[PDB]
Design an enzyme around this catalytic site. Sequence first.
Site, PDB file in Angstrom:
ATOM      1  N   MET A  38      28.293  20.684  33.523  1.00  0.00           N
ATOM      2  CA  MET A  38      29.349  21.572  33.549  1.00  0.00           C
ATOM      3  C   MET A  38      29.561  22.748  32.745  1.00  0.00           C
ATOM      4  O   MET A  38      30.655  23.339  32.910  1.00  0.00           O
ATOM      5  CB  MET A  38      30.547  20.734  34.056  1.00  0.00           C
ATOM      6  CG  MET A  38      30.720  20.029  35.140  1.00  0.00           C
ATOM      7  SD  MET A  38      32.463  19.111  35.663  1.00  0.00           S
ATOM      8  CE  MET A  38      32.751  18.721  33.875  1.00  0.00           C
ATOM      9  N   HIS A  42      27.275  21.107  24.273  1.00  0.00           N
ATOM     10  CA  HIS A  42      27.330  20.758  22.941  1.00  0.00           C
ATOM     11  C   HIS A  42      26.371  19.927  23.000  1.00  0.00           C
ATOM     12  O   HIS A  42      25.473  19.418  23.808  1.00  0.00           O
ATOM     13  CB  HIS A  42      28.798  19.989  22.632  1.00  0.00           C
ATOM     14  CG  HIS A  42      29.217  18.956  23.717  1.00  0.00           C
ATOM     15  ND1 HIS A  42      28.407  17.732  23.571  1.00  0.00           N
ATOM     16  CD2 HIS A  42      29.951  19.008  24.827  1.00  0.00           C
ATOM     17  CE1 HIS A  42      28.827  16.809  24.700  1.00  0.00           C
ATOM     18  NE2 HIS A  42      29.803  17.782  25.139  1.00  0.00           N
ATOM     19  N   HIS A  45      25.147  17.248  25.250  1.00  0.00           N
ATOM     20  CA  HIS A  45      24.330  17.795  26.218  1.00  0.00           C
ATOM     21  C   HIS A  45      22.919  18.082  25.886  1.00  0.00           C
ATOM     22  O   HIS A  45      21.860  17.738  26.655  1.00  0.00           O
ATOM     23  CB  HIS A  45      24.709  19.206  26.900  1.00  0.00           C
ATOM     24  CG  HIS A  45      26.182  18.908  27.454  1.00  0.00           C
ATOM     25  ND1 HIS A  45      27.257  19.627  26.903  1.00  0.00           N
ATOM     26  CD2 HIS A  45      26.526  18.756  28.690  1.00  0.00           C
ATOM     27  CE1 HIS A  45      28.288  19.373  27.788  1.00  0.00           C
ATOM     28  NE2 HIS A  45      27.863  18.834  28.775  1.00  0.00           N
ATOM     29  N   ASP A  77      28.046  30.735  25.050  1.00  0.00           N
ATOM     30  CA  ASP A  77      26.664  30.802  24.636  1.00  0.00           C
ATOM     31  C   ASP A  77      25.701  29.594  25.096  1.00  0.00           C
ATOM     32  O   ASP A  77      24.683  29.280  24.448  1.00  0.00           O
ATOM     33  CB  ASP A  77      26.505  30.719  23.103  1.00  0.00           C
ATOM     34  CG  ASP A  77      27.338  29.621  22.565  1.00  0.00           C
ATOM     35  OD1 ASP A  77      27.730  28.758  23.320  1.00  0.00           O
ATOM     36  OD2 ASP A  77      27.280  29.082  21.312  1.00  0.00           O
ATOM     37  N   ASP A  78      26.232  29.187  26.406  1.00  0.00           N
ATOM     38  CA  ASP A  78      25.374  27.945  27.035  1.00  0.00           C
ATOM     39  C   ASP A  78      23.906  28.381  27.211  1.00  0.00           C
ATOM     40  O   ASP A  78      23.327  27.786  26.841  1.00  0.00           O
ATOM     41  CB  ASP A  78      26.044  27.732  28.468  1.00  0.00           C
ATOM     42  CG  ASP A  78      27.538  27.006  28.166  1.00  0.00           C
ATOM     43  OD1 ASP A  78      27.771  26.657  27.100  1.00  0.00           O
ATOM     44  OD2 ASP A  78      27.918  26.753  29.321  1.00  0.00           O
ATOM     45  N   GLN A  81      22.113  28.621  24.122  1.00  0.00           N
ATOM     46  CA  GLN A  81      21.652  27.201  23.378  1.00  0.00           C
ATOM     47  C   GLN A  81      20.433  26.514  24.385  1.00  0.00           C
ATOM     48  O   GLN A  81      19.776  25.933  23.608  1.00  0.00           O
ATOM     49  CB  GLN A  81      22.805  26.423  23.810  1.00  0.00           C
ATOM     50  CG  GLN A  81      24.065  26.626  22.889  1.00  0.00           C
ATOM     51  CD  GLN A  81      25.037  25.314  22.666  1.00  0.00           C
ATOM     52  OE1 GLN A  81      24.811  24.423  21.990  1.00  0.00           O
ATOM     53  NE2 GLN A  81      26.263  25.585  23.215  1.00  0.00           N
ATOM     54  N   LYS A 149      27.932   8.566  27.964  1.00  0.00           N
ATOM     55  CA  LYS A 149      29.171   8.923  27.914  1.00  0.00           C
ATOM     56  C   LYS A 149      30.123   8.454  29.176  1.00  0.00           C
ATOM     57  O   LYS A 149      30.970   8.100  29.268  1.00  0.00           O
ATOM     58  CB  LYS A 149      29.395  10.357  27.391  1.00  0.00           C
ATOM     59  CG  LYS A 149      30.767  10.869  27.265  1.00  0.00           C
ATOM     60  CD  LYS A 149      31.299  11.071  26.117  1.00  0.00           C
ATOM     61  CE  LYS A 149      32.730  11.250  25.815  1.00  0.00           C
ATOM     62  NZ  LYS A 149      33.505  10.818  26.906  1.00  0.00           N
ATOM     63  N   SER A 185      32.557  15.476  23.365  1.00  0.00           N
ATOM     64  CA  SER A 185      32.956  15.968  24.612  1.00  0.00           C
ATOM     65  C   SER A 185      33.514  17.504  24.354  1.00  0.00           C
ATOM     66  O   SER A 185      34.351  17.704  23.371  1.00  0.00           O
ATOM     67  CB  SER A 185      33.926  15.049  25.174  1.00  0.00           C
ATOM     68  OG  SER A 185      34.580  15.529  26.176  1.00  0.00           O
ATOM     69  N   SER A 186      33.369  18.259  25.352  1.00  0.00           N
ATOM     70  CA  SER A 186      34.069  19.269  25.340  1.00  0.00           C
ATOM     71  C   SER A 186      35.796  19.420  25.239  1.00  0.00           C
ATOM     72  O   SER A 186      36.239  20.233  24.744  1.00  0.00           O
ATOM     73  CB  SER A 186      33.803  20.441  26.639  1.00  0.00           C
ATOM     74  OG  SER A 186      33.847  19.498  27.892  1.00  0.00           O
ATOM     75  N   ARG A 187      36.212  18.132  25.754  1.00  0.00           N
ATOM     76  CA  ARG A 187      37.459  17.944  25.714  1.00  0.00           C
ATOM     77  C   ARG A 187      37.972  17.967  23.971  1.00  0.00           C
ATOM     78  O   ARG A 187      39.329  17.987  24.021  1.00  0.00           O
ATOM     79  CB  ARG A 187      38.117  16.625  26.413  1.00  0.00           C
ATOM     80  CG  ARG A 187      37.828  17.063  27.868  1.00  0.00           C
ATOM     81  CD  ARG A 187      38.603  15.881  28.667  1.00  0.00           C
ATOM     82  NE  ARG A 187      38.595  16.305  30.198  1.00  0.00           N
ATOM     83  CZ  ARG A 187      39.014  15.410  30.817  1.00  0.00           C
ATOM     84  NH1 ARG A 187      40.054  14.522  30.675  1.00  0.00           N
ATOM     85  NH2 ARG A 187      39.029  16.019  32.400  1.00  0.00           N
TER      86      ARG A 187
END
Lengths: 277, 277
Positions: A38, A42, A45, A77-78, A81, A149, A185-187
């Site tokens: 999604m 990070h 991923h 910056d996905d 990366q 995860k 996690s992005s969270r």
Amino acid sequence: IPAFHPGELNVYSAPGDVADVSRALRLTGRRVMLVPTMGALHEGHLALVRAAKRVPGSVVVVSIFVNPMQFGAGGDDDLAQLRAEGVEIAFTPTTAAMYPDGLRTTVQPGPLAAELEGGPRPTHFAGVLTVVLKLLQIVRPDRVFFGEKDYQQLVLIRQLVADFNLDVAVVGVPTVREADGLAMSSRNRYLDPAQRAAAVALSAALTAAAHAATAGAQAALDAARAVLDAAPGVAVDYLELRDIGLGPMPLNGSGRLLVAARLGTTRLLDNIAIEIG
Amino acid sequence: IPAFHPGELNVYSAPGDVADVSRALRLTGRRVMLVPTMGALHEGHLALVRAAKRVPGSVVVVSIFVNPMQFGAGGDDDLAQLRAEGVEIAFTPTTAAMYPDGLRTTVQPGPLAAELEGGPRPTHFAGVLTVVLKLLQIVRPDRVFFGEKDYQQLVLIRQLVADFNLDVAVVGVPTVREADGLAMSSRNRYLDPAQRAAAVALSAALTAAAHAATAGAQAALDAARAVLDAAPGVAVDYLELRDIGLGPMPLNGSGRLLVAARLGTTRLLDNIAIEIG
Ligand SMILES: Nc1ncnc2c1ncn2[C@@H]1O[C@H](COP(=O)(O)O)[C@@H](O)[C@H]1O
Ligand SMILES: Nc1ncnc2c1ncn2[C@@H]1O[C@H](COP(=O)(O)O)[C@@H](O)[C@H]1O
């Protein structure tokens, strides 16, 4: 056929463009790997991407798509990366391209979708399985990578692939953690410094459980619950011990302990392998 | 890999065996064609097989499977016929082989599944689409063949393939009829001689409609209804005029007229292309 530049990042948003490039590449013997995400990428991923890249000659396809919520469900910056990881294809479809005829035919998961994460969000895994089935058909990868995860998600993807006879290998990749054990996690970005410090309780509770388990299942659960109860700003949603397929835990064997907990408004998940006695 | 004898009939019942043979054959450049059936084969099925066979070098795979009924829903020389048609693969799985983990993940069709044939049988097309999706994944055909006889089914398969991004061509094959126009069906065997004679009313009504249509949609419907009303032992379940995708019929254009009717206990279907004015 859309242009494809080998050894460079190639971005496509139309399903047909990725399907044609993937088909052409697979014919040359380059195996295609799919890593669904999604975005907001990070190191968790990147572990999936690196696992895909280990396959010699593979074309790694990373999709970035946020599936819309169904009725009654609430909620850079996905590319740079991905380029630095040697990913050759980024697939970034719009909602309209994924659902040109709206939400019409969909996948109905089995009853495990109503348990655990499906309790608060009873339509969530139908959306996940629908999207993953589409991505698999567009890309036709040899292997698709999912993180431990999201363990319940990974188990449900295995069910999807078994139940629909999909000719893809599902590869589960271990959870990437911060130095103190917090699952990436992005969270985690929503947490203030104090909450971030307190959030170590989830991994501390699970790892304590995994060691307590030499003394049996109840000892493992009780150790985890004690650690969580010791963290005053952590509110537990669930803490459950199950078999590895998320059925009922057996008397003696391999299991999985799963926790979901809230720090203020941020809900975090973690899970760990457990071996009973 | 299971043995495959080219230019002979090869019968497999395990999904894995057909999947391995199909994959190996496709790699040689032989295109794979899939013709799904419920067995009890007749000339209507053979038209699908012959259409598949027209594709040069094709391996024709004919599946024979009767999908179990879901809760609350009521309801031989096949292989010799396939052999005489030059079919190289017959796939004849058991229920247990198709559903080793029971009915778990399934396909949920769009709302067209609740209309027409879905009225009396609201779970029927979920079963159809689930089975066809599985067959498509096991066999991985280049093209799959369905008869216009089951027009709503054919339209729903097109939706399945669009909505799940399936890389298969769906080929609709015209309805095969007896000399008097009666659409061929294994159900015709249930009719006694008088009912068989009366059953010509369905095709007579539709063909009359298709010609009446120069005078517009109402003229077409009224002509069909008059023919059916003239046949005392034919009880009409529905007679509906729709667009070719089974949405509402437009003011001017191509449509489809569909009828379902009972002769005693036997329910028969027919449908025809209609051009308005
Ligand atoms: N910390 C992590 N370790 C391993 N996999 C992860 C981690 N965070 C996310 N993932 C995986 O990355 C994929 C995309 O996650 P998301 O972008 O959150 O949909 C999913 O398979 C996740 O399980
Ligand atoms: N009279 C017919 N003409 C064309 N196709 C037919 C006919 N009867 C059956 N079929 C097709 O054969 C396939 C298998 O039918 P069934 O065995 O009834 O599932 C379906 O695609 C049907 O639409």
